[PDB]
Design a protein around this ligand. Structure first.
Ligand code: CHL
Ligand code: CLA
Ligand code: CLA
Ligand code: CLA
Ligand code: CLA
Ligand code: CLA
Ligand code: CLA
Ligand code: CLA
Ligand SMILES: CC(/C=C/C=C(C)/C=C/[C@@]12O[C@]1(C)C[C@@H](O)CC2(C)C)=C\C=C\C=C(C)\C=C\C=C(C)\C=C\[C@@]12O[C@]1(C)C[C@@H](O)CC2(C)C
Ligand SMILES: CC(=C/C=C\C=C(C)\C=C\C=C(C)\C=C\[C@@]12O[C@]1(C)C[C@@H](O)CC2(C)C)/C=C/C=C(C)/C=C/[C@@]12O[C@]1(C)C[C@@H](O)CC2(C)C
Ligand code: SF4
Lengths: 219, 203, 11, 42, 742
């Protein structure tokens, strides 16, 4: 199972990683001359985190449109993913507080989460020592930064068997890559046609020949 | 040693062992690497804590009372402008002399720890305190709560230091609120509490 | 343009 | 902190701070007293 | 193959090294015994090649220094933009550019210097600026102050980012040696990435932002009513009304029928009558073509893949009639030593700057730039001085390489050896041609003066007695005039108006451009230019060639690049090092540049610039006396230096007094330089001895014993002061004259 594998890339890609298909034409994860933010472990961690966040965003950007079209949500609430107030020139919506107040609140909460994550990445078992209202016991981590586990992050006990765990890791990385591609498609479509992706799918299904990339670009 | 620190999971600097009251290993810039620097910084922080604490009390008590109909004291920002029984410069000079005597005594104590513990006029009086920044004696410790076990003393000093830090932050916040907005701090607090959503700095 | 010149002579 | 003070004690830095302070004092004196060709105090 | 190789934390950031000076060199690091130590600590500060010998440390230090320089440049740009935003009259100048003088500096009111706040116009007082920034901002489309504020903030942020990047790359992740020596990837990225993408993006900005705003401005609309630039992007109706072609979108470009875009991508050429500048459509078209060409040309060298070309293969495989084997070991020489690369790059940059100056005065690329005479004069003079300095520095670095980085054992080059083996013939022929050119060119002027003084005006080399016309230049001018009809079917008009024939172009009652005639004076002046250039080339080439060894001193390489002399023997051997040759060539470069700028200034003031009336006649500034008065030295001294200095000296009590003050100060510094240039060290040391005795008599003698400056330091001080004084004199004179009368 090799995709565009090169002689240089096949040397250090031993297959001991989920979704390791030996694909690296530019040789970024080469194991000599590694420094700064270029290191195979950091790159793998970043890929996993990107996949998770992209899956969350891809689900959340397409849920409201479908929910509104099905009639399960009030019409004034269902909006395309760029009319929600992210891009004020495209559109704006009103909430229970100003946009910048919500920005500050999200920044504070995400800082509290992400600084603890970063300190865990730096020192493995340090983060579960200091008193944190008793929660630190569940935040010790499993020693692998990518998959901390523990009661808080693995309450259902999934992936006890090593083979099942490997299969689940492969599923996670594949779904993350798919969601990243989907988010890129969302961005480009919203840049070109200026309409939510669900409406694009509906128009394509209504008449595929008259609705595609070519007709908008005309010729 | 294993006390809580400002940044959990990090390593505290080597010159903050943890014996000092109110310590959390917060000194990224390394401004207190030298010992004399440490002593001067400790004294400055203690004095700043006390002064800012008195200032916060004297700013936030009369203003809150004036929010009620009990008193009619004017706003803290305009206190300097309002007229009094003498020109401001004379009061400034008298205050300068009176505070300068005490500051000279304190500075002499700082340079030489045990040289100004005796009353020059009547030598029967004395100051029993045996630490720089904690004069002791009847004048400054009339109840005698200062003397005690080292653990209780450390706890009390930590409480005083933390209250002082909060007071400094509150005083600076009140000043910046008055200049930026232009209204009494209690008015801003009530406006924020009425509408926590939109009544922020962004407005 | 007057305000820009006045910025130097504020004191 | 020791070496920071040592560097700030070097000749060019001390010289430039001293000359800046002196120039500021002269500038402020000339602004407070606009112009003078003789000493009229005595 | 091609990869990223870095070292983690080669050095640790600590204040311990700051405490003691001179840590780079041990002899400096020992401690100061005399004052000379101080003067050494600055002389070897950036001599990275002598602190160590490993190439890795030198390369890392070079990278960090480059980052620091970039940060400084960004800070300077941010400061200029903020000054334009805050203390300026840009908005007043925008509405009425012809009758308002640009100004972006305001003086305080401390002592009596408030008289420097001259009345430029538009309800503002301040120092008039001649940097040409206002034209740049207007051509960019900026019509407010908030945009300038945002640009200044962005510049400050970029400066901070550059400083952080420099620190990070020196102290945290330092690239390894093999990373630096990968020139194929460097060339590919510098051609395709830096020069192609940048010009393509600028063409995008010009097409999308600058063109519509400038069209609205030229149409006569008030600046405060023009729509904001982003409204053009958001609204297709406005663009469609302004340009119908945009109504079709990007469809034509993908369909290869590009003629639809002929509305705003033209080939007319010439000058725009309204503003006296190049058509912005032509500039955008040129930028797009340049982007395409650079992107195509950036994919030539083989990097990490099968396709491409090898630099070593190209150099080795080239067989020619005159060269032969030739270029064989040049790759190692050019990839091993930094000094060769520095020399080549310096020469190229100097030549490019000179060409830039010529092309920029020939064809004004900004609106309302041609009619501003002070800006044109300042830009031309500044750019030519910069080019001359860079060209001079190239020779010094070539000499450094030849002295300290050349060995024939490990790295051998055939062409370099062949050049070295017959240096005498080269020097002899250069000397002969210099003598002949100078003799003829200056003898013509001397003969003109002598025949003038004797009352024999019919025996001159003039436009009436004996004619020497530059026939080749006139033929070229005629060919360029006739080219647009036949040689350039696409171009509607001439490339520039400087070529003879055509029509005068004037804006707002002031002449912008007209054909420049050529006669005997141009012939003589061009030959003088050639003479000075040849002499400077001779000095620099002799210094470079005879650096390693000479007939007088057979072992000049051991003594080094910077040694004052060898001794009183052999008849005297002062100034034999290549450093002294550079120090000698600086004066001749200064002479040549001064003569060239004088020629340009007088010709432009006499036969191009001026005023035009309603009837149609043109009155030039000096009455067109250059053609008859510039053939004698008396004419250059009387009609140019004496006549045009009235405005400089009679500026006392007015808003131009600083120019007269600088005029006198430059004279003082020029006279001061001769003190170091003429005297010697021994006298000063012997005087310092008596002064030191007088000091020791009163117990105030220092521990660092005073010492007179070394010979090389004395020569360097002399040449620095001389150049500074001359350049400042010319600067003050030019600026005062052209601000007063222009
Ligand atoms: C101890 C700290 C101290 C602090 C933080 C302040 C702070 C302030 N004082 Mg006050 N004062 C302080 C001590 C004193 N003040 C005054 C008497 C005044 C006067 C007379 C005035 C101020 C003014 C001001 C306000 C604006 C001044 C400005 O920055 O310009 C500012 C909030 C001004 C103000 O409140 O009115 C507009 C004003 O003009 N202060 C005296 C008596 C000499 C003081 C003695 O320590
Ligand atoms: C530098 C160049 C220069 C030149 C070209 C001239 C030219 C001229 N001068 Mg001026 N002059 C000069 C400098 C110069 N002057 C200087 C520095 C002064 C001192 C102030 C004067 C003062 C002066 C005076 C006082 C007078 C002149 C006059 C004249 C004329 C007389 C020439 C003559 O008869 O001898 C020419 C003699 C020759 C032998 C020519 C030799 C050169 C040949 C052609 C060489 C060619 C070489 C060959 C082609 C190379 C290859 C060889 C190969 C084929 C094998 C002539 C037009 C006289 C006059 O009034 O005229 C109108 C006059 O009375 N001159
Ligand atoms: C979002 C960023 C991202 C990142 C950081 C990674 C990271 C990684 N990938 Mg994944 N991957 C991604 C997205 C990403 N991937 C996408 C979208 C796909 C398509 C489905 C894949 C498919 C894929 C395959 C098939 C393979 C990997 C593998 C790897 C590893 C080695 C390659 C390398 O180091 O690239 C790191 C790259 C960068 C730091 C950034 C490059 C992004 C460029 C500059 C921008 C392109 C954007 C523009 C809009 C187009 C590394 C852990 C290899 C492996 O080891 O498997 C585990 C492997 O064989 N990846
Ligand atoms: C001026 C030229 C310049 C050059 C030649 C380099 C060169 C290098 N950088 Mg440095 N760097 C620079 C400026 C430069 N840097 C600046 C201005 C900063 C401050 C932001 C940094 C901060 C920096 C960091 C933080 C790191 C490097 C690293 C690297 C190395 C790998 C680069 C890489 O693979 O890209 C890969 C690039 C991309 C996939 C990301 C592109 C996405 C950005 C946001 C878009 C920029 C687009 C616009 C032009 C390489 C030695 C890396 C390293 O050490 O590797 C060993 C690394 O960790 N650099
Ligand atoms: C991953 C991050 C993510 C983020 C940042 C958002 C962001 C947002 N969501 Mg979405 N959403 C997500 C994932 C996410 N969603 C997922 C996984 C689902 C499926 C349950 C939804 C389903 C959803 C609904 C049903 C609604 C939103 C709406 C909103 C908005 C306000 C809701 C709020 O107050 O909380 C805000 C733009 C609300 C809205 O008003 O949209 C304009 C709305 O009613 N979201
Ligand atoms: C790139 C070089 C640069 C240069 C040469 C100048 C030069 C100048 N600045 Mg500008 N300035 C710059 C960048 C630069 N600035 C930048 C990047 C900013 C943004 C932070 C400013 C913001 C600025 C302000 C806000 C002011 C000046 C002023 C001045 C003038 C007085 C400076 C002074 O006396 O110091 C004072 C000495 C010390 C602080 C010690 C002087 C002409 C002053 C002015 O001209 O007022 C009329 C003034 O008020 N500048
Ligand atoms: C493109 C950039 C460039 C670079 C990177 C270098 C790099 C180098 N040069 Mg080269 N050089 C250049 C251009 C450049 N040069 C040009 C244009 C010239 C022609 C003048 C020279 C001529 C030259 C000479 C003659 C020498 C070098 C040498 C050196 C090396 C030592 C630098 C030194 O110690 O100075 C440290 C810094 C100083 C001494 C600063 C001196 C102060 C300057 C001269 C004053 C300018 C006055 C100022 C503008 C006026 C304001 C007035 C106000 C202050 C009152 C260094 C590797 C030296 C060598 O030995 O190489 C190994 C050497 O001897 N260079
Ligand atoms: C016009 C230019 C010039 C000037 C100004 C001087 C000046 C001087 N000569 Mg020199 N000299 C010159 C040309 C000049 N010389 C020439 C052409 C020669 C022939 C080779 C000599 C040969 C010579 C000899 C043989 C001797 C001197 C000596 C002297 C000194 C005499 C005492 C005196 O006048 O002090 C008056 C002092 C001043 C006018 C100096 C200028 C003061 C400056 C402007 C003050 C600094 C202010 C300002 C903040 C500068 C900052 C700089 C900036 C980078 C920040 C004095 C330094 C004699 C000596 O050394 O006596 C002790 C002596 O022995 N000279
Ligand atoms: C994380 C991400 C997107 C996250 C989006 C989120 C959270 C969105 C959230 C919101 O929508 C909601 C929910 C609701 C809205 O109201 C608000 C927003 C805020 C909008 C995208 C990543 C997107 C990442 C992408 C597209 C990455 C692509 C990478 C590629 C193609 C790399 C290729 C190669 O690197 C390889 C693999 C190997 C090398 O050898 C060769 C090359 C070619 C270099
Ligand atoms: C003393 C003080 C401090 C305030 C305010 C003091 C403040 C905000 C101090 C902040 C210090 C900071 C943030 C330092 C940070 C760090 O140094 C650390 C700790 C460690 C390093 O490693 C890192 C860095 C970041 C360098 C304030 C005193 C105020 C007084 C007396 C007010 C008196 C009055 O109100 C009354 C009573 C009545 C009014 O009518 C009149 C006035 C006169 C107005
Ligand atoms: S000491 Fe001076 S005079 Fe003597 S040879 Fe050297 S440079 Fe010439």
């Amino acid at each position: 199972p090799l995709w565009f594998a090169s002689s240089q890339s096949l040397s250090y890609l031993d297959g001991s990683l989920p979704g390791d298909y030996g694909f690296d034409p530019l040789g970024l994860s080469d194991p000599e001359g590694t420094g700064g933010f270029i290191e195979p472990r950091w790159l793998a961690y970043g890929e996993i985190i990107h996949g998770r966040f992209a899956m969350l965003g891809a689900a959340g950007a397409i849920a409201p449109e479908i929910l509104g079209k099905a009639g399960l949500i009030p019409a004034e609430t269902a909006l395309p993913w760029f009319q929600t107030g992210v891009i004020p020139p495209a559109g704006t919506y009103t909430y229970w507080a100003d946009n910048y107040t919500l920005f500050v609140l999200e920044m504070a909460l995400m800082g509290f989460a992400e600084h603890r994550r970063l300190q865990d990445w730096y020192n493995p078992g340090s983060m579960g020592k200091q008193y944190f209202l008793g929660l630190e016991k569940g935040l010790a981590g499993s020693g692998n930064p990518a998959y901390p586990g523990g009661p808080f992050f693995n309450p259902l006990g999934f992936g006890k068997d090593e083979k099942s765990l490997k299969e689940l890791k492969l599923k996670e990385v594949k779904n993350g890559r798919l969601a990243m591609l989907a988010i890129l498609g969302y961005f480009i479509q919203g840049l070109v046609t200026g309409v939510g992706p669900y409406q694009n799918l509906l128009d394509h299904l209504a008449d595929p020949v008259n609705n595609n990339v070519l007709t908008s670009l005309k010729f | 040693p294993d006390r809580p620190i400002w940044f959990p999971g990090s390593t505290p600097p080597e010159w903050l062992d943890g014996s000092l009251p109110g310590d959390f290993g917060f000194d990224p810039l390394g401004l207190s690497s030298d010992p004399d620097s440490l002593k001067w910084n400790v004294q400055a922080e203690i004095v700043h804590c006390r002064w800012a604490m008195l200032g916060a009390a004297g700013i936030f008590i009369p203003e809150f009372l004036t929010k009620i109909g009990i008193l009619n004291t004017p706003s803290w920002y305009t206190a300097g402008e309002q007229e009094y029984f003498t020109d401001k410069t004379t009061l400034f000079v008298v205050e300068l002399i009176l505070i300068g005597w005490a500051e000279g005594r304190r500075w002499a104590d700082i340079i030489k720890p045990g040289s100004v513990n005796t009353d020059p006029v009547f030598p029967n009086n004395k100051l029993t305190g045996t630490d720089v920044g904690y004069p002791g004696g009847l004048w400054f410790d009339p109840l005698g709560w200062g003397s005690g076990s080292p653990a209780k003393l450390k706890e009390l000093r930590t409480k005083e230091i933390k209250n002082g830090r909060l007071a400094m932050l509150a005083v600076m916040g009140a000043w910046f609120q008055h200049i930026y907005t232009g209204t009494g701090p209690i008015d801003n607090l009530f406006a924020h509490l009425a509408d926590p959503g939109h009544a922020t700095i962004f407005a | 343009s007057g305000a820009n010149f006045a910025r130097a002579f504020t004191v | 902190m020791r070496d920071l003070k040592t560097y700030l004690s070097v000749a060019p830095v001390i010289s430039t701070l001293w000359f800046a302070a002196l120039a500021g004092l002269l500038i402020e004196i000339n602004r407070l007293f606009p112009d003078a060709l003789i000493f009229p105090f005595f | 193959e091609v990869k990223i190789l870095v070292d983690r934390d080669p050095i640790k950031t600590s204040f311990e090294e700051w405490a003691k000076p001179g840590h780079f060199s041990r002899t400096i690091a020992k401690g100061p015994d005399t004052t000379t130590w101080i003067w050494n600590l600055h002389a070897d500060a950036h001599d990275f090649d002598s602190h160590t010998s490993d190439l890795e440390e030198i390369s890392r230090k070079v990278f960090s220094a480059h980052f620091g320089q970039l940060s400084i440049i960004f800070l300077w740009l941010s400061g200029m933009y903020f000054h334009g935003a805050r203390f300026s009259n840009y908005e007043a100048w925008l509405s009425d550019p012809t009758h308002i003088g640009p100004s972006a500096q305001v003086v305080w009111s401390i002592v009596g210097q408030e008289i420097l706040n001259g009345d430029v116009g538009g309800g503002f007082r301040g120092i008039q600026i001649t940097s040409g920034f206002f034209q740049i901002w207007r051509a960019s489309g900026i019509t407010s102050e908030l945009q300038l504020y945002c640009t200044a903030i962005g510049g400050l942020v970029f400066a901070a980012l550059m400083l952080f990047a420099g620190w990070f790359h020196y102290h945290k992740a330092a690239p390894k040696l093999a990373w630096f020596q990968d020139v194929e990837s460097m060339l590919n990225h510098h051609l395709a990435g830096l020069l192609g993408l940048g010009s393509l993006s600028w063409a995008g900005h010009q097409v999308h932002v600058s063109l519509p705003i400038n069209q609205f401005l030229n149409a006569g609309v008030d600046p405060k009513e023009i729509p904001l630039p982003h409204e053009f992007i958001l609204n297709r109706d406005l663009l469609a009304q302004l340009y119908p072609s945009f109504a079709e979108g990007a469809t034509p470009f993908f369909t290869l029928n590009w003629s639809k875009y002929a509305e705003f991508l033209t080939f007319r050429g010439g000058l725009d009558p309204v503003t006296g500048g190049l058509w912005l459509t032509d500039i955008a078209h040129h930028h797009l073509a340049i982007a395409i060409l650079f992107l195509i040309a950036g994919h030539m060298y083989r990097t990490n893949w099968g396709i491409g070309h090898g630099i070593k293969d190209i150099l080795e495989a080239h067989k020619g009639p005159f060269t032969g084997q030739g270029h064989k070991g040049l790759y190692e020489i050019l990839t091993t030593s930094w000094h060769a690369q520095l020399s080549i790059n310096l020469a190229m940059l100097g030549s490019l700057t000179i060409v830039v100056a010529h092309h920029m005065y020939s064809m004004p690329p900004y609106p309302y730039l041609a009619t501003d005479y002070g800006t044109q004069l300042s830009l031309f003079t500044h750019h030519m001085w910069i080019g001359g300095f860079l060209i001079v520095g190239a020779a010094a670095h070539a000499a450094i390489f030849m002295v300290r980085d050349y060995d024939p054992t490990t790295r051998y080059n055939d062409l370099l050896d062949r050049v070295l083996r017959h240096r005498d013939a080269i020097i002899s022929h250069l000397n002969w041609v210099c003598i002949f050119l100078g003799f003829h060119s200056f003898g013509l002027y001397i003969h003109n003066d002598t025949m003038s003084a004797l009352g024999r005006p019919q025996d001159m080399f003039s436009d009436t007695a004996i004619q020497l016309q530059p026939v080749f230049a006139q033929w070229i001018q005629n060919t360029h005039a006739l080219a647009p009809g036949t040689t350039a079917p696409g171009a509607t008009t001439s490339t520039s108006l400087t070529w003879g024939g055509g029509d005068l172009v004037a804006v707002g009652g002031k002449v912008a451009l007209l054909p420049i005639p050529l006669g005997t004076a141009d012939f003589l002046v061009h030959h003088i230019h050639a003479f000075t250039i040849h002499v400077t080339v001779l000095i620099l080439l002799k210094g470079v060639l005879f650096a390693r060894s000479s007939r007088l001193i057979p072992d000049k390489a051991n003594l080094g690049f910077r040694f004052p002399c060898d001794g009183p023997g052999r008849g005297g051997t002062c100034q034999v090092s290549a450093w002294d040759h550079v120090f000698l060539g600086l004066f001749w470069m200064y002479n040549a540049i001064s003569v060239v700028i004088f020629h340009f200034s007088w010709k432009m003031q006499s036969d191009v610039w001026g005023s035009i009336s309603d009837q149609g006649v043109v009155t030039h500034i000096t009455g067109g006396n250059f053609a008859q008065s510039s053939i004698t030295i008396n004419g250059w001294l009387r009609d140019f230096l004496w006549a045009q200095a009235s405005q400089v000296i009679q500026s006392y009590g007015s808003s131009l007094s600083a120019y007269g003050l600088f005029f006198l100060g430059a004279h003082f510094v020029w006279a001061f330089s001769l003190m170091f240039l003429f005297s010697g060290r021994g006298y000063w040391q012997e005087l310092i001895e008596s002064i030191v005795w007088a000091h020791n008599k009163l117990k105030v003698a220092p521990a660092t014993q005073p010492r007179a400056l070394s010979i090389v330091q004395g020569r360097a001080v002399g040449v620095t002061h001389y150049l500074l004084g001359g350049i400042a004199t010319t600067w003050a004179f030019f600026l005062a004259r052209i601000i007063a009368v222009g």
